[PDB]
Design a protein around this ligand. Sequence first.
Ligand SMILES: *[C@@H]1O[C@H](CO)[C@@H](O[C@@H]2O[C@H](CO)[C@@H](O[C@@H]3O[C@H](CO)[C@@H](O)[C@H](O)[C@@H]3O)[C@H](O)[C@H]2NC(C)=O)[C@H](O)[C@H]1NC(C)=O
Ligand SMILES: *[C@@H]1O[C@H](CO)[C@@H](O)[C@H](O)[C@H]1NC(C)=O
Ligand SMILES: [Ca+2]
Ligand SMILES: [Ca+2]
Ligand SMILES: [Ca+2]
Ligand SMILES: [Ca+2]
Ligand SMILES: [Ca+2]
Ligand SMILES: [Ca+2]
Ligand SMILES: [Mg+2]
Lengths: 595, 493
Amino acid sequence: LNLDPVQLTFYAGPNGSQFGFSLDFHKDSHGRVAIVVGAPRTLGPSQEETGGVFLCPWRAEGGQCPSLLFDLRDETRNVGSQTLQTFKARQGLGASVVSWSDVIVACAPWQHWNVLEKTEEAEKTPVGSCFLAQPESGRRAEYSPCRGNTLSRIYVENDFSWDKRYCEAGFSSVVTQAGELVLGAPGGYYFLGLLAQAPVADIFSSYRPGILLWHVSSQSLSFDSSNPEYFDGYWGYSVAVGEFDGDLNTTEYVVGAPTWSWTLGAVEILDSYYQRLHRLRGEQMASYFGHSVAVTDVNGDGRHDLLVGAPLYMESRLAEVGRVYLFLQPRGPHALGAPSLLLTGTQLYGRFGSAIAPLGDLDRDGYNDIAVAAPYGGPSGRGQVLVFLGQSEGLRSRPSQVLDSPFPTGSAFGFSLRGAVDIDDNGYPDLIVGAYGANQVAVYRAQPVVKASVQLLVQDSLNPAVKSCVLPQTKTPVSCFNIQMCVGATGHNIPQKLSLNAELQLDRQKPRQGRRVLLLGSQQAGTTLNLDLGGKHSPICHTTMAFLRDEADFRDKLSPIVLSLNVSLPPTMAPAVVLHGDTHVQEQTRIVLDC
Amino acid sequence: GPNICTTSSCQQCLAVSPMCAWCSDEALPSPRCDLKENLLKDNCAPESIEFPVSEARVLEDRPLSDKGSGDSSQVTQVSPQRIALRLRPDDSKNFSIQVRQVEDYPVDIYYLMDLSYSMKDDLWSIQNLGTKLATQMRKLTSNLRIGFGAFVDKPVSPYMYISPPEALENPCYDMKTTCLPMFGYKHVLTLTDQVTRFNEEVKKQSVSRNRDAPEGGFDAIMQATVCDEKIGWRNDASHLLVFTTDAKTHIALDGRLAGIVQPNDGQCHVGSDNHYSASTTMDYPSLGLMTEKLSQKNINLIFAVTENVVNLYQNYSELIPGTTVGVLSMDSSNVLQLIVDAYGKIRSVELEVRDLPELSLSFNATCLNNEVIPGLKSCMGLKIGDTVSFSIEAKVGCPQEKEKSFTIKPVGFKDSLIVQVTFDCDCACQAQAEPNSHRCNNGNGTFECGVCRCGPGWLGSQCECSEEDYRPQDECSPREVCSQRGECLCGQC
Ligand SMILES: *[C@@H]1O[C@H](CO)[C@@H](O[C@@H]2O[C@H](CO)[C@@H](O[C@@H]3O[C@H](CO)[C@@H](O)[C@H](O)[C@@H]3O)[C@H](O)[C@H]2NC(C)=O)[C@H](O)[C@H]1NC(C)=O
Ligand SMILES: *[C@@H]1O[C@H](CO)[C@@H](O)[C@H](O)[C@H]1NC(C)=O
Ligand SMILES: [Ca+2]
Ligand SMILES: [Ca+2]
Ligand SMILES: [Ca+2]
Ligand SMILES: [Ca+2]
Ligand SMILES: [Ca+2]
Ligand SMILES: [Ca+2]
Ligand SMILES: [Mg+2]
């Protein structure tokens, strides 16, 4: 709602693009936050297809960020017969970035790995990897469960089972609250999908430079499945962490399979033991249900809620426009299955739902908020971010704000969206929009929100011929009533330069020269006053006095008086304020005399 | 009868109701803005108001052919072809069109084959097909062009075996066999009627092998459709595209597995090498883009998929109108009958709307040829060359873009109709508007065909008074035309 569109933070990257495929907020232990962006198609050791990650300090003007190296070299180790080796060709370092407690985990899902066992070989297959690093410490603990030495003949022998040659671990990187790192591998089990879990502390403990194999304590890998629906399931395409079970103190992983059950799609909730507590499938085939998955409690009830993206949805306008499915967390026995809000974009081929970013209390509204992105939406397919507030009792169905791509067509503005981290540390979380091949990363800063609570004090009714008030000049006896207005500013971090303007309307329904009551001071049927609330918490109530003419004067006495007070922000750069809540009170006064 | 239109100027009376008119006489300022028959009753007999035309006048029409001689204009299937429409704002007009299948119709057929190892044997059953296909299609054509093309999958690392280096030269090295380097999509044989050249260009095909079941067929369909010049689709022909495969296929954004993210554009890249030049450097096409490009070029599509993946592919037919699925045999020796039934099923009428500008249309179940039987709506039973009647009710306010001509073209047939729909909303007197009517407040009133339209307080019949200034001037009465409260209420004086 309060995300500043007119001013944005622009971060540049390599001319080879991909700067913005994935990104996250690196929360420093000191309390600072900086944006870490993976560019999975930067230059290699010698102009090679590789990845790469940049670390941008949080700023406003922006610029060329420094680069954080993880691993770019074709290693080769001779374990007896097996001369195993790694290949950086199109590794994609930066396709998944997640940060936690001074550690950054950035993945290269398409990194290759071949083991030469004399004549036979393991084939140069994309096992993928995800490299961990504490930039302050400098320690690098690369993690790659799918790296192995089992030669291809063994795979071919029995049933091509328990394979990890092309798992592509790290297609989606997330980290729990405790620091446990979770990685997706869509290609695991012969292009079926597996997951990896390992403590970052344990990963750093068990890692040894040079050697290209380990087990790293009790790292938890997903179970291989022979179910036909899982074939080419593409599990671990997108992952997130949130609390969903009946017990606390445990972190669940939500994983998306956009091709589950013959491109139908699914999303699953897993514990650390991978018990599959809940699984919700898609509705439209080839709609890519699960491309991006987000976890946040926008309802404000505390219990986390689920958002699932289907950018390839074909709306029954059969127009290819994505859709975000919302799932509030209920208190039923087997609840959470039925979706509640189905948000759908407008621009054709917009891919509405490629990036769902939790935002938390974006506008100090008391409920969490979200930002969905359609990378090819908008007027001319540029791509647009749709901010949806909590609003309680569900989610804001309408876009509280629409952020337009300032990038040319095809930049896919809005592929990776992250929020839920107050970058301004002002109770107002910000948003970051990165896009694959964008070459630029945009950051939206939220602005203070002012809720208004408005009340009126007007006499309910009176005799038009009371004749108690006295006109100054003419000295005529007239009836009159007490008109007062009190508007107060609620919310957090309200700016002290507030200049709210209140406009009063007496007999609003009646037109001009059809009006009945009329102000003494200004001789007008309505005025605006600077009812500024800046610099104080108490409401301002400056009254007025409008006279009511004699019976014989007018004839609109049969019409009851309408007293509508409407408060609006001043019209006079960036407003830095968003009026919300009650802003128009129309308490009424009727005319009562005999009939 | 007070009616509704009575309860501002020439334009408003042409927009409030389809029936009421605005007497545009500057000699006489009665209901004025009311029903035209009432205007005759209140003596507006000349009816100076220029009503909107609100009817369709054709500009170009030709009779529907029966069998088709062969000329471009002698095989007319859709009547009419160019009409002009001038509906009034908020008015609905239903007009009928007649479409034909022209019976005999030259056909273009392109055969896309999954050149994977799993159906290499099937390629053998395809070696001698041109003679049989020509024999089975001669009865239902007069100029039958055929062409051939092959798809395997995107030749990228997760799908294409990349080591040992002999796998690049021979992907089936490990089974002690020789195959061809894997390719995305290649243009083997251009569209032609020469069966000898077809069976010559076949038998020269070497299959390849991919790592996984999902094939890259849709990326081949895209380039087959867009490269109309390369494939050689005729300007006037019944287009088909037979597509034979055994397993799943990749969809859009799957290229992230291969690391390629750029979505499928709308250009042709099949170059002189007759191969998909940018297969690796582009994502697989979405189903929506597939439907869009299969309907823009009228290229109907036929799915010859094995029994394993029928349900997967037939469900795509729902999301891609104009396509059919077929249970291809394991040996793929039944594709001849598959193409026969494809031509006998989808060419047997689909009405679809295109480039529609505030408009809405609906067809009232006319069909048949010129009759209207709501019972026999989805009766089918059409053999060939069937006329069909489609009466669409175009419903519209007044669009700001006065000039507009939208196109309606059915599925597959290139014969299209152009509706120059130009809504009439204003008046000729409105263009005149009499800006300085002498009788209206001393020659300053813009007498809009019956209404003065002037003055903040002097806005009467001659811009002289208003509902305001009500009080107990002597005209209708010595009060404030001129009576009790505001202008004049007769009897109240
Ligand atoms: C092609 O489309 C059809 C029509 O949707 C698919 O068949 C239907 O698939 C849905 C799954 O999306 C089935 O619903 C599920 O059924 C299971 C029982 O098997 C139930 O436990 C679930 O709660 C859910 O209701 C539906 O029964 C099924 N119906 C029929 C008539 O087949 C079909 O699967 C699609 N082909 C594919 C995906 O290859
Ligand atoms: C979580 O809370 C405390 C602190 O870790 C722990 O002792 C307790 O057992 C946990 N509660 C659970 C697992 O339900
Ligand atoms: Ca838990
Ligand atoms: Ca909930
Ligand atoms: Ca908020
Ligand atoms: Ca902030
Ligand atoms: Ca076969
Ligand atoms: Ca495959
Ligand atoms: Mg095959």
